[PDB]
Design an enzyme around this catalytic site. Structure first.
Site, PDB file in Angstrom:
ATOM      1  N   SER A 264     -32.958 -42.059   0.078  1.00 11.38           N
ATOM      2  CA  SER A 264     -32.808 -43.241  -0.729  1.00 11.38           C
ATOM      3  C   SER A 264     -34.159 -43.979  -0.760  1.00 11.38           C
ATOM      4  O   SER A 264     -34.918 -43.997   0.232  1.00 11.38           O
ATOM      5  CB  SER A 264     -31.754 -44.193  -0.124  1.00 11.38           C
ATOM      6  OG  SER A 264     -31.747 -45.460  -0.776  1.00 11.38           O
TER       7      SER A 264
ATOM      8  N   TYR B 128     -27.818 -48.580   7.017  1.00 11.26           N
ATOM      9  CA  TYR B 128     -27.821 -47.453   6.096  1.00 11.26           C
ATOM     10  C   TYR B 128     -29.238 -47.052   5.743  1.00 11.26           C
ATOM     11  O   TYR B 128     -29.588 -45.886   5.829  1.00 11.26           O
ATOM     12  CB  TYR B 128     -27.021 -47.835   4.847  1.00 11.26           C
ATOM     13  CG  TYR B 128     -27.285 -46.961   3.658  1.00 11.26           C
ATOM     14  CD1 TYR B 128     -26.587 -45.772   3.477  1.00 11.26           C
ATOM     15  CD2 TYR B 128     -28.148 -47.369   2.664  1.00 11.26           C
ATOM     16  CE1 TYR B 128     -26.758 -44.997   2.334  1.00 11.26           C
ATOM     17  CE2 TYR B 128     -28.360 -46.583   1.539  1.00 11.26           C
ATOM     18  CZ  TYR B 128     -27.647 -45.404   1.359  1.00 11.26           C
ATOM     19  OH  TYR B 128     -27.878 -44.627   0.210  1.00 11.26           O
TER      20      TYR B 128
HETATM   21  N1  LIG Z   1     -25.590 -44.481  -5.679  1.00 11.61           N
HETATM   22  C1  LIG Z   1     -26.829 -44.899  -5.293  1.00 11.61           C
HETATM   23  O1  LIG Z   1     -27.348 -45.929  -5.721  1.00 11.61           O
HETATM   24  C2  LIG Z   1     -27.667 -44.133  -4.318  1.00 11.61           C
HETATM   25  C3  LIG Z   1     -29.005 -44.521  -4.105  1.00 11.61           C
HETATM   26  C4  LIG Z   1     -29.808 -43.805  -3.198  1.00 11.61           C
HETATM   27  C5  LIG Z   1     -29.197 -42.739  -2.520  1.00 11.61           C
HETATM   28  N2  LIG Z   1     -27.891 -42.405  -2.759  1.00 11.61           N
HETATM   29  C6  LIG Z   1     -27.322 -41.294  -2.033  1.00 11.61           C
HETATM   30  O2  LIG Z   1     -26.687 -40.396  -2.951  1.00 11.61           O
HETATM   31  C7  LIG Z   1     -25.790 -39.608  -2.181  1.00 11.61           C
HETATM   32  C8  LIG Z   1     -24.516 -39.426  -2.949  1.00 11.61           C
HETATM   33  O3  LIG Z   1     -23.994 -40.719  -3.195  1.00 11.61           O
HETATM   34  P1  LIG Z   1     -23.392 -41.144  -4.665  1.00 11.61           P
HETATM   35  O4  LIG Z   1     -23.964 -42.510  -5.003  1.00 11.61           O
HETATM   36  O5  LIG Z   1     -23.486 -39.947  -5.552  1.00 11.61           O
HETATM   37  O6  LIG Z   1     -21.829 -41.445  -4.247  1.00 11.61           O
HETATM   38  P2  LIG Z   1     -20.425 -41.184  -5.019  1.00 11.61           P
HETATM   39  O7  LIG Z   1     -20.629 -40.953  -6.529  1.00 11.61           O
HETATM   40  O8  LIG Z   1     -19.502 -42.276  -4.554  1.00 11.61           O
HETATM   41  O9  LIG Z   1     -19.938 -39.812  -4.382  1.00 11.61           O
HETATM   42  C9  LIG Z   1     -19.875 -39.587  -2.973  1.00 11.61           C
HETATM   43  C10 LIG Z   1     -19.444 -38.128  -2.801  1.00 11.61           C
HETATM   44  O10 LIG Z   1     -19.448 -37.864  -1.379  1.00 11.61           O
HETATM   45  C11 LIG Z   1     -18.154 -37.293  -1.048  1.00 11.61           C
HETATM   46  N3  LIG Z   1     -17.957 -37.665   0.348  1.00 11.61           N
HETATM   47  C12 LIG Z   1     -17.920 -38.921   0.777  1.00 11.61           C
HETATM   48  N4  LIG Z   1     -17.796 -38.946   2.117  1.00 11.61           N
HETATM   49  C13 LIG Z   1     -17.747 -37.677   2.551  1.00 11.61           C
HETATM   50  C14 LIG Z   1     -17.649 -37.024   3.875  1.00 11.61           C
HETATM   51  N5  LIG Z   1     -17.538 -37.802   4.988  1.00 11.61           N
HETATM   52  N6  LIG Z   1     -17.659 -35.663   3.890  1.00 11.61           N
HETATM   53  C15 LIG Z   1     -17.814 -34.918   2.750  1.00 11.61           C
HETATM   54  N7  LIG Z   1     -17.930 -35.452   1.520  1.00 11.61           N
HETATM   55  C16 LIG Z   1     -17.887 -36.806   1.369  1.00 11.61           C
HETATM   56  C17 LIG Z   1     -17.184 -37.891  -2.041  1.00 11.61           C
HETATM   57  O11 LIG Z   1     -15.960 -37.151  -2.113  1.00 11.61           O
HETATM   58  P3  LIG Z   1     -14.620 -37.445  -1.223  1.00 11.61           P
HETATM   59  O12 LIG Z   1     -14.227 -38.922  -1.355  1.00 11.61           O
HETATM   60  O13 LIG Z   1     -13.726 -36.373  -1.801  1.00 11.61           O
HETATM   61  O14 LIG Z   1     -15.169 -37.102   0.159  1.00 11.61           O
HETATM   62  C18 LIG Z   1     -18.031 -37.788  -3.312  1.00 11.61           C
HETATM   63  O15 LIG Z   1     -17.985 -36.440  -3.894  1.00 11.61           O
HETATM   64  C19 LIG Z   1     -25.626 -40.307  -0.807  1.00 11.61           C
HETATM   65  O16 LIG Z   1     -26.401 -39.594   0.154  1.00 11.61           O
HETATM   66  C20 LIG Z   1     -26.227 -41.682  -1.047  1.00 11.61           C
HETATM   67  O17 LIG Z   1     -26.653 -42.315   0.153  1.00 11.61           O
HETATM   68  C21 LIG Z   1     -27.123 -43.059  -3.629  1.00 11.61           C
END
Ligand SMILES: NC(=O)c1ccc[n+]([C@@H]2O[C@H](COP(=O)([O-])OP(=O)(O)OC[C@H]3O[C@@H](n4cnc5c(N)ncnc54)[C@H](OP(=O)(O)O)[C@@H]3O)[C@@H](O)[C@H]2O)c1
Ligand SMILES: NC(=O)c1ccc[n+]([C@@H]2O[C@H](COP(=O)([O-])OP(=O)(O)OC[C@H]3O[C@@H](n4cnc5c(N)ncnc54)[C@H](OP(=O)(O)O)[C@@H]3O)[C@@H](O)[C@H]2O)c1
Ligand SMILES: NC(=O)c1ccc[n+]([C@@H]2O[C@H](COP(=O)([O-])OP(=O)(O)OC[C@H]3O[C@@H](n4cnc5c(N)ncnc54)[C@H](OP(=O)(O)O)[C@@H]3O)[C@@H](O)[C@H]2O)c1
Ligand SMILES: NC(=O)c1ccc[n+]([C@@H]2O[C@H](COP(=O)([O-])OP(=O)(O)OC[C@H]3O[C@@H](n4cnc5c(N)ncnc54)[C@H](OP(=O)(O)O)[C@@H]3O)[C@@H](O)[C@H]2O)c1
Lengths: 260, 260, 260, 260
Positions: D148, D161
């Site tokens: 991130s 985080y």
């Molecule tokens: N969104 C942002 O602004 C942002 C910014 C920087 C970095 N990131 C990073 O991007 C990555 C993905 O996040 P996102 O924003 O794409 O979130 P998202 O759209 O809410 O999706 C999260 C995904 O993770 C799965 N998941 C959650 N907890 C889990 C666990 N304990 N074991 C296995 N699978 C799990 C969820 O499915 P289930 O509920 O079926 O488990 C879902 O497929 C993360 O590493 C996050 O820190 C996000």
């Protein structure tokens, strides 16, 4: 090697100093992905050979113009030739950079200092000012700077050069912040030791002078770069695959550590 | 404020552009710690006032010489005056830097660009070449550059200036690597918004124009800097308290985030 | 050079893991500058020797308590002992850190991984939460983390350790942003190879195994650090000489390059 | 723009936490470029929907398995399922990461702290140890971490985080140095605010709460990211277009500045 990527259909790019080495690889790749490309370098014979080389591989949407990149007259000629040949400009790759000095930084004259900045930094700022309105008129585009890993890790012997490349990190960023309003993304690459005419003195004593360099340079991946190692990154940075990335430098050095 | 530190007894320092603001605070602090100090700036009246100001506080091991820091003639005069007054040179603080432009980076002329680098970068390289043999003759010493936080976070309006300060990060490092053989440590400071004549236009609309700036700048500590906020760092960097530190920049910006 | 600095009169510091090496030098320096200091380490005999060593130099405003730094019971005991002995807490130096593993990162067990983070990171977070209200009650103060240059340059053999130190860069910053409202500044040091029991395996084949290490490591200043090389920095960061600096890491590695 | 890139024919990737948002876009892109892909997430219904979604677009070289990414049993099941379905593993994308807390860093319990590291860091280390021999057996490959931008700029409310993400920068680098001998390149992405369920609380007050967020955040490009903004980068990093790049993080934040 062929990626089948065609992210550059209907785009026009200028790649400076692009008749040998990294620049020619960048131009070739953009041409493979459907761009029209203008290349330039000082020597008409180098321009001619590079154009022939590309056309022999079937990459015919290319043209060339000989010019000194730090000449304001030649800068204008390069940009005008591009507009005459292809009607517009989407991308500028500021690949040029020189390294005439070799020695201690204290031995770099004021004149050599100024020359280093003139060619390595100022010329890219100037090219950027010239292409700017043309790129903006296409709704945006990209500008890429070829800096160097030595922006980050000050090398022995070519330290003044290195400083110019640090400057390009800052210039890449400043232009990124400033040209975002025109949807022009500005990024750079910071290559390690790439096997080209420029770096030749370091690596041309056999297989083992190359291995000794890989050792000293601390290259995780255990080999020197080649021009093609830069091209996929430039293509990525100039395409929509990086449409949310501006102001960044990507180090292309086989794992050499110089920032987090 | 008085630290009782006396880490500079029997040392001689030059502090450039040191008749107002950060430079004068640096000179005052080095004088409090027992140094002999030469200050300089363009205007003899500013030199006179600064010398009187310091001598009124009892800091009498100070002398001053008016000069343009980017004049090669005045550089030589500054270094020779230092040697005439105090017999040696241990420390150079390259505090000078200008910021004439305000506007978009695309509106910076080639001439203004060159001038920015001439004063902000080249002059410190030149001063470094002149003091070098004298510092080396004392067995080593220190050189400090005053860069800016805007080396790291490209600001709006003064982006070309910012680029010069990025360059100083690289120059600080390059000089550090190169002068280590002479036990000359080279470090820098990268201040945030410090209340001085230079930054005056940003903060001189009352208490709340200052608070609004603190907000926009995202200053964790919730206030603007003052010149004295730089001086303790410079003293630290030029003393034996940092004898194992070379090539580093210390950001002095109240917690503004721009690198790891 | 004993500096004559006396920036800590009437201040109380806790320095963790401070009965040998860097921590003891940190404690000694704070004591020389007039602080009251609590040290701790696991082994009561080491506590006793360190206290005797300091009191023999006339530094009597010191007390010690044996404890494991990653024990929540011992953390609370350390903070309560400090408050019982000296009434308040101004400064915390989280000096502790372990490195049990030596080998490839792929050979680090899940258990050893967790232990590394538990001691090297979590314990500093925990100590920070315990001292926080007490430091805030004094109107502010300072917390310093001892990370490592290997936060920035991933080393062979102790890479997992290195990762914990990268984490500390982030933790330093996060705590800085979060505790600024209490005028608590949080900064860190990132030492290079410092000659202590911990780093002994890297440098202990005589005086030219040390010179061979300084070339491998690319240490500009041509020597290994000693504990005292860190102390001046800690003192600086914990004093008003750095009152406008928060969230920063100072690399103390003799000029090894790992970020800009 | 569907790129026509087909850099992944005959390659197998595992993309963790890939049934929504960034992970699903990563998987979809790898599938568009000819990879076979295994996705996973906790909830079988999400797995089922994601597989249906991909197969409806004609991307049939996909399989899914429900599991908790920080369960050692589920990790082993994910890797074994991938080997059962597709025979080999070339690429691992450690996309997973959680953020349960929202509040001040001082209010993060020891338990929540450990959980953050367990899922956000340790699970990626564990997955890396499990896939390692399989990727090495193919002659090399690639591992990508989704960190991130908040690794670099410590955010309010989710600072703990953020620290986990700083750790991932270090882990990316450490694994890069360590797995280079197997020609496994390890790189990461550091996204800014990407519109997904995870970041929803930051951006979900209409289209000018989004524009207000892009000014607060100082996003040069004047908009929030979408999942697809990450995918081109992941594909680039996992392909031969980056064959000389290891240990690097690419910030994907629309021009937010947090390192040089
Ligand atoms: N969104 C942002 O602004 C942002 C910014 C920087 C970095 N990131 C990073 O991007 C990555 C993905 O996040 P996102 O924003 O794409 O979130 P998202 O759209 O809410 O999706 C999260 C995904 O993770 C799965 N998941 C959650 N907890 C889990 C666990 N304990 N074991 C296995 N699978 C799990 C969820 O499915 P289930 O509920 O079926 O488990 C879902 O497929 C993360 O590493 C996050 O820190 C996000
Ligand atoms: N090789 C490396 O290890 C390395 C590492 C990091 C960064 N870089 C950077 O990569 C860039 C290109 O270098 P390279 O290694 O590919 O060098 P190269 O193979 O020697 O290529 C030099 C190219 O630049 C042209 N050129 C030289 N001076 C010029 C001028 N004044 N105006 C216009 N064109 C000029 C040359 O053609 P003419 O002779 O026809 O002008 C040729 O096309 C430079 O910015 C360099 O600093 C190189
Ligand atoms: N204030 C800030 O917010 C800030 C932030 C980051 C970095 N800095 C850096 O701090 C340094 C000093 O700035 P400051 O803010 O203390 O400015 P200031 O208070 O306006 O002081 C300027 C000083 O420089 C002298 N000067 C100006 N041009 C000169 C020249 N050509 N040759 C020699 N001396 C010259 C001035 O005296 P004369 O008029 O007598 O020449 C005066 O002594 C600069 O490098 C600046 O870039 C400032
Ligand atoms: N030496 C280096 O090259 C180097 C380089 C960069 C960073 N560092 C960092 O410097 C810091 C101090 O290391 P050093 O090199 O000074 O080591 P050192 O001289 O071996 O001393 C370690 C100190 O920590 C104490 N200690 C060890 N484990 C402990 C625990 N679990 N709880 C409480 N106290 C404990 C020891 O006392 P007991 O045995 O009595 O507990 C001793 O006082 C560490 O954070 C290290 O990572 C060191």
């Amino acid at each position: 090697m062929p990626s089948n990527c065609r992210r550059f259909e209907g785009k026009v790019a200028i790649v400076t100093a692009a008749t040998k080495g990294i620049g020619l690889a960048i131009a070739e790749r953009l041409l493979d992905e459907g761009a029209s490309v203008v290349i330039g370098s000082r020597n008409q014979k180098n321009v001619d050979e590079a154009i022939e080389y590309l056309k022999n591989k079937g990459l015919t949407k290319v043209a060339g113009i000989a010019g000194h990149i730090a000449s304001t007259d030649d800068q204008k000629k390069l940009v005008d030739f591009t507009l005459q040949k292809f009607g517009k400009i989407n991308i500028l790759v500021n690949n040029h950079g020189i390294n005439p000095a070799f020695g201690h930084i204290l031995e770099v004259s004021d004149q050599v200092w100024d020359k280093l900045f003139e060619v390595n930094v100022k010329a890219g700022f100037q090219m950027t000012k010239l292409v700017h309105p043309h790129i903006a008129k296409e709704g945006g585009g990209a500008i890429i700077f070829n800096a160097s890993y030595s922006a980050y890790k000050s090398p022995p012997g070519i330290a003044a050069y290195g400083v110019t490349k640090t400057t390009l990190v800052g210039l890449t960023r400043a232009l990124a912040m400033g040209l975002a309003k025109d949807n022009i993304r500005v990024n750079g690459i910071a290559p390690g030791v790439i096997k080209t005419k420029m770096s030749q003195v370091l690596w041309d004593g056999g297989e083992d002078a190359e291995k000794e360099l890989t050792d000293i340079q601390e290259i995780a991946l255990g080999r020197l770069g080649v021009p093609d190692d830069c091209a996929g990154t430039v293509a990525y940075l100039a395409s929509d695959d990086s449409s949310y990335i501006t102001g960044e430098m990507i180090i292309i050095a086989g794992g050499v550590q110089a920032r987090l």
